Ligand SMILES: CCc1ccc([C@H]2C[C@@H](C(F)(F)F)n3ncc(C(=O)O)c3N2)cc1
Ligand SMILES: CCc1ccc([C@H]2C[C@@H](C(F)(F)F)n3ncc(C(=O)O)c3N2)cc1
């Protein structure tokens with residue numbers, strides 16, 4: 043079938059994630075469809091995009107079961123981010139609920155964010171033994187400030203909507219309709235001005251290749267027994283006993 | 288005549304923009320006079336500068352009509368910024384009212400900012416089809432946070448004095464007299480300490496040459512029909528109809 | 533004797549500065565002992581460190597009298613920072629009171645900060661004619677925002693606990709016990725995830741070699757008569773009369 047919905051009102055294209063049965067957690071199909079929707083957003087008269095989730099969550103992470111193309115997922119995910127980064131259109135994220143893990147990455151790749159009052163943002167990587175790419179860390183630091191980024195990454199701290207507004211992670215607190223109204227205003231602005239500013243802003247240095255030591259630690263985390271222990275402990279409904287290996 | 292006023296009380300030199308008939312919008316003469324005032328600020332016993340505007344605005348942008356040396360304006364403007372950056376003296380901006388476009392650039396080149404309660408900051412570039420230099424974008428991101436910088440640049444969002452205080456764009460809310468009092472305290476501090484910190488702070492990376500793609504998009508914006516359309520639409524008192532070309 | 537105390541409750545190691553007779557101001561001995569404590573923190577079962585000061589101050593700066601190894605102090609201080617940066621353990625600073633000069637540097641080298649309501653942070657370098665290393669300036673800018681960093685460095689502005697919470701310099705307002713409770717939660721998280729994120733965060737660019745002009749100005753400040761004048765004026769209980777030389 044299809045895992046997203048696409049609609050257009052005048053010059054604003056709204057893309058809605060439609061996998062609420064997994065709180066919009068990503069898989070290969072959802073990512074592929076999103077990539078195509080972004081790439082084709084300029085086929086009509088659209089001048090702005092609103093990206094949002096169906097139901098209570100914006101995107102709760104990733105869920106690859108039972109994804110017949112799960113091995114392709116990580117690469118397709120990178121392709122989606124490249125498509126958003128390269129789009130001449132501004133993407134307004136209507137963050138309607140929790141944005142967690144891959145969902146937080148996706149929210150951060152939007153150009154602007156309108157956040158529902160009860161939404162929150164989180165990287166629970168420290169609870170699962172995983173490591174992030176450098177852009178995720180740099181862009182987060184730019185949006186919440188270095189100090190809060192340390193807490194989010196080292197302790198799995200949740201960022202509330204209210205604090206997101208304080209830091210600028212949220213540009214506004216509001217609803218999907220609020221996001222669509224703002225997008226309508228943006229769609230009336232000069233496209234080449236928007237395109238230039240978006241490119242320069244995205245080229246602030248957040249797009250960064252992992253240093254050699256970063257890659258070493260990244261691979262050590264991903265190949266560790268602790269990653270397995272976090273998964274087993276969850277299935278057995280008990281606290282994980284991590285060993286640092 | 289002259290488009291600025293210069294006065295000194297003890298060790299504080301106050302420079303006032305005096306083109307209130309255009310809300311202190313810059314031209315070649317005003318820029319040249321400001322550059323000279325900054326360069327000569329150390330001829331006396333001055334240890335701090337206060338920069339401010341006459342009337343309701345700090346600086347509402349640029350107005351080159353009918354400037355006999357308008358072709359020279361962009362280069363002279365860069366020279367002014369170089370002079371402020373190179374000055375061993377700390378410049379306290381008493382931002383007495385709106386700082387818009389070139390006025391926001393000028394405010395950001397000050398070392399510290401004391402902002403009047405009703406002042407605001409804005410880059411309305413997206414309403415006019417124009418593109419900014421990279422420093423304007425980087426220094427703005429550092430002062431308001433990356434998230435708010437995206438909104439200011441992509442949607443022409445105004446930054447209020449209250450929010451400026453929250454982000455650190457405003458170091459204090461207050462008046463010209465308040466700025467002059469603080470400058471007096473600063474003038475009693477150790478000059479070589481101030482000089483070192485100013486140089487290192489300004490060398491945070493904001494002074495950045497445009498990347499090749501940035502230059503391409505910058506020139507595309509400036510040479511576009513949309514830039515003309517914004518001007519014509521204003522003269523005809525109607526909404527612009529931008530085409531992205 | 534010893535100038536620090538070291539205790540462990542389960543998986544949290546608490547290191548306490550114990551020179552309250554100088555408000556925990558550093559010297560060669562205190563720095564050496566701290567370095568050893570950090571290096572050996574992983575000899576037991578510890579997974580997190582809490583760093584704190586005895587009495588009313590976290591660390592009020594440096595006091596090298598009468599330190600028989602004072603000439604070694606600057607190098608040993610750098611060694612301490614290297615040890616904290618290299619530690620696989622997250623260091624939670626329980627900033628129990630003022631963190632000034634070397635004390636602010638030490639607080640900033642912690643991975644997370646829990647700050648007492650009456651604590652404050654300050655670099656009074658401008659009152660003493662001194663210059664800082666580039667990391668101190670970059671890490672401060674990342675924690676309080678560029679705008680407040682300008683005020684702290686150019687005017688010796690104090691950062692209150694409340695404003696520290698706003699900017700993310702403080703992750704939480706609270707007590708030593710509060711810090712120890714949070715550290716206990718962190719000690720249950722996956723160590724390799726924490727290690728990766730800490731390394732990437734610390735490699736944001738704050739660790740920066742002084743540019744040639746920065747070194748020139750740094751040496752000019754440190755060798756100036758104004759540095760001597762600040763010290764003499766203090767001893768004579770009068771305002772300093774700085775000359776910029
Ligand atoms: C060029 C625009 C851009 C920006 C950020 C990224 C991030 C996305 C992020 C995500 F998980 F979301 F896929 N990611 N994951 C791994 C990588 C990588 O580059 O190795 C990587 N790169 C990819 C592309
Ligand atoms: C070295 C200190 C410094 C810092 C920033 C700038 C900015 C100013 C800014 C302004 F419009 F204000 F003139 N500007 N405009 C164009 C450029 C440029 O460098 O191409 C440019 N460079 C110029 C000089």
Ligand SMILES: CCc1ccc([C@H]2C[C@@H](C(F)(F)F)n3ncc(C(=O)O)c3N2)cc1
Nearest residue numbers: 606609610613614617637638665667668739
């Ligand atoms: C590699 C981790 C790291 C990070 C910052 C520093 C700072 C500490 C700081 C302090 F005063 F605290 F010792 N400092 N002082 C001088 C220097 C230097 O590098 O020249 C310098 N370097 C040293 C080491």
